[PDB]
């Protein structure tokens, strides 16, 4: 037990799912925000065509 | 020849080997102990399934 419970403390940085499931909270995170992002699309496009206009601000 | 003055031997094995047995003992309560520190935030996260 004490061989095994060392490799299995070893291994803790990736292996355990605690960390899984922090990265995966991290990746429905960036998800959520990149789609948020993505579903306006049209109206991004309209803020790209809006340059230095002085007569149609 | 193995059995003429084998009493303090045995004995003496007997001795540091329940030494031995406290000490690994006594170590790996210690290390399970510091894993279990780092464990704690974890304890109540290990309800999510593995292959879920």
């Known amino acids: 037990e004490i061989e095994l419970l060392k490799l299995e403390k070893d291994t803790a940085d990736v292996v355990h799912p605690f960390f899984l499931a922090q990265k995966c909270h991290t990746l429905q995170s960036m998800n ?5 992002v993505l579903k306006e699309k049209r109206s991004l496009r309209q ?4 340059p230095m206009c002085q007569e149609n601000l | ?3 003429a003055s084998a009493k ?3 004995e003496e094995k007997l001795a540091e080997l329940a030494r031995q047995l406290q000490e690994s003992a006594a ?3 210690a290390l399970r102990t510091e894993y279990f520190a780092q464990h704690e935030q974890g304890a109540a ?7 879920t």
């Open chain 1, 32 to 36: 959520n925000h990149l789609e948020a």
């Open chain 1, 47 to 50: 803020r790209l065509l809006k």
């Open chain 2, 1 to 3: 020849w193995a059995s």
């Open chain 2, 8 to 10: 303090s031997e045995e």
């Open chain 2, 27 to 29: 170590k790996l309560h």
């Open chain 2, 45 to 51: 996260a290990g309800a999510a399934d593995i292959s």
